[PDB]
Amino acid sequence: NSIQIGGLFPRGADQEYSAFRVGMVQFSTSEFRLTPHIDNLEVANSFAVTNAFCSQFSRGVYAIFGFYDKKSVNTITSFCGTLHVSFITPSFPTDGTHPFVIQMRPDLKGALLSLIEYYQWDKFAYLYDSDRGLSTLQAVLDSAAEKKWQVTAINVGNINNDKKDETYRSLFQDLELKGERRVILDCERDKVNDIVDQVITIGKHVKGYHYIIANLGFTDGDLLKIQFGGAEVSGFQIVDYDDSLVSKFIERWSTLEEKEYPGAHTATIKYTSALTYDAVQVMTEAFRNLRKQRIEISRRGNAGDCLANPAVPWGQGVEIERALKQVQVEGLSGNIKFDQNGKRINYTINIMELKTNGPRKIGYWSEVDKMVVTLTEEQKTVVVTTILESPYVMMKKNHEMLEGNERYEGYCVDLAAEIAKHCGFKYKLTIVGDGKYGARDADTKIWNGM
């Protein structure tokens, strides 16, 4: 019962393949064993993807687990749709109806929009790059037109890293111009970190700013940078470490040696890698459900050339597809189930906020219930501005010998003493700079005076 399954790991992806192997070990059974053929490539390269896919095809794999990019995703979808070969991916969900594709990643749109509705954001700024596609952009734009939102859409992906210093400074300058504080970062974690560093550098992480990171990796990255910055930061988490399953898995993960499994010694795990593990689970359970239903998918002969025209798909493929789509299992991503098209259903996205002490879950998001909230949670010297007028505020004859509030005498001085006495605060009497009571300048439209 050797089941050949192809796989595609982008060069530099370690923890993903590590969790893949861990999945191979944990979900292995005496009944059947998966025989992976791993192929590393350049994921952004369409040619490389095509070559690897046809390589796995000619090898006669019954399923493929891999990743795609905004460039290469259409190649994967089209080829898998044509040759009826099932593809399992942690990578971003495709917007549309794509057959023979199983997307492990949940759709983040609803969680995000409900988050915007929760924080009651009338106007905000949306920073995006074209990596995972502009689907989310379209979503928030249509929802902006529907709910009467004023949204600033800015593409941060087209700015070159070599020349980008003052570009972001000008970006946040123009963003500070309108007094717009609320900001949403939809980006790959690297670009996120860059933008973060630029923010702390420009001091935009101070109080008054609210950042929303849109991804499932909110706690996977370093939050210590802006943690003490004083700006509120919110995000989404697909992995709950309080769960017993995830906790034990984490114990086994953290006990593992780093030499054998690269980057596998950690307190946490990137959500992509977790999605990979759960993907292994889904494949195992799928073929198990195939064996229990007594259906033999075994290949009679070699697949031949994938490019051979006219392309002919195998019959078994559809059966394997249905087998995968009908799977419902419990995993690190929560409840795992798919619809007819292969997208995730009935998932749970934990809504989390970054606090002083650290990150915490303020709620959860469901496909039906939308946002649901979890457990609800000296004296400074008072500056007194005043102007010189008799007998309200006057300089004492000996005033040069004195300092502070002892310098001034008058009705308003005594009144100030009384007010401070009743309200219980320490007060510092100061004379206004411009020497005006108050006014609006007809030119600058700026208020002058006390």
Partner 1 sequence: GPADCCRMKECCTDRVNECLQRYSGREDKFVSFCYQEATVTCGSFNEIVGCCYGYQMCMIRVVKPNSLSGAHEACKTVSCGNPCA
Ligand X SMILES: *[C@@H]1O[C@H](CO)[C@@H](O)[C@H](O)[C@H]1NC(C)=O
Q: What are the residues binding ligand X (CB under 6 A)?
A: 345-346, 366-368
Separation between Cα atoms, residue 124 and residue 147, nearest integer Å: 13
204 binds partner 1 per the rule CB under 8 A = no
Closest CB to partner 1 among residues 426, 436: 426
The DSSP line for 100-145 is TEEE-SPP-HHHHHHHHHHTT-SEEEEEE-SSS-SHHHHHHHHHHH
Q: Decide which of a second copy, partner 1, ligand X, none touches 345; Cβ closer than 5 to 8 Å per partner kind.
A: ligand X
82's contact among ligand X, partner 1, a second copy, none, with CB below 5 to 8 A by partner kind, is a second copy
Please choose which of ligand X, partner 1, a second copy, none residue 305 contacts, taking the beta carbon within 5 to 8 angstroms, the exact cut-off set by kind.
none
Find tokens 């759709």 and name the residue: 107
Residue pair 60/303 in contact (Cβ under 8 Å)? The answer is yes
368 binds, among a second copy, ligand X, partner 1, none (CB under 5 to 8 A by kind): ligand X
Q: Select the span of 47-55, 186-194, 264-272, 284-292 touching a second copy (CB under 8 A).
A: 47-55
Which of positions 67-96 make contact with partner 1 (CB under 8 A)?
Answer: none
Least distance from C-beta 97 to partner 1, angstroms? 35
Q: Are strands 2-10 and 63-65 parallel, antiparallel or unpaired?
A: parallel
- When CB distances are held under 5 to 8 angstroms depending on the partner's kind, the choice from a second copy, ligand X, partner 1, none that residue 181 binds is partner 1
Cβ proximity to partner 1, 117 vs 165, nearer residue: 117
* Minimum CB distance to ligand X smaller for 368 or for 375: 368
DSSP string, 17-84: HHHHHHHHHHS--SS-EEEEEEEEE-TT-HHHHHHHHHHHHHTT-SEEE----TTTHHHHHHHHHHHT
- 83 in Cβ contact with 104 (< 8 Å): no
3-state secondary structure of 285: helix
Tell me which of 181, 191, 204, 343 binds partner 1, using CB under 8 A.
Answer: 181
* DSSP state letters, 150-201: EEEEEE-SSS-TTT-SHHHHHHHHHHHHTT---EEEES-HHHHHHHHHHHHH
If one asks whether residue 385 binds partner 1 (CB under 8 A), the answer comes out as no
Q: Decide if 345 contacts 338 (C-beta within 8 A).
A: yes
CB of 121 to partner 1, least distance (A): 7
Largest distance between two CA atoms of the chain: 111
Find out whether 261 and 277 touch, Cβ atoms under 8 Å: no
**Can residue 244 be called a binding residue for a second copy (CB under 8 A)?**
no
The option from ligand X, partner 1, a second copy, none interacting with 367 (CB < 5 to 8 A, set by class) reads ligand X
Rounded Cα gap, residues 404 and 241, in angstroms: 57
CB nearer to a second copy: pick between 120 and 309: 309
Which residues make Cβ contacts (< 8 Å) with residue 142, sequence separation at least 6?
A: none
Q: Using the rule CB under 8 A, which residue among 32, 149, 241, 392 binds partner 1?
A: 149
Contacting residue, 26, 40, 45, 326, with a second copy by CB under 8 A: 45
Q: Which residues neighbour 100 within 8 Å (Cβ) at sequence distance 6 or greater? A: 80, 81, 84, 85, 86, 87, 317, 321, 342
Choice between 337 and 361, CB closer to ligand X: 337
| Min separation Cβ 346 and ligand X, Å | 4
Q: Which residues bind a second copy (CB under 8 A)?
A: 45-47, 50, 54-55, 71-72, 74-75, 77-79, 81-83, 95, 130, 134, 137-138, 141-142, 144-146, 148, 150, 152-155, 158, 169, 174, 177, 200-203, 205-207, 225, 228-231, 307, 309
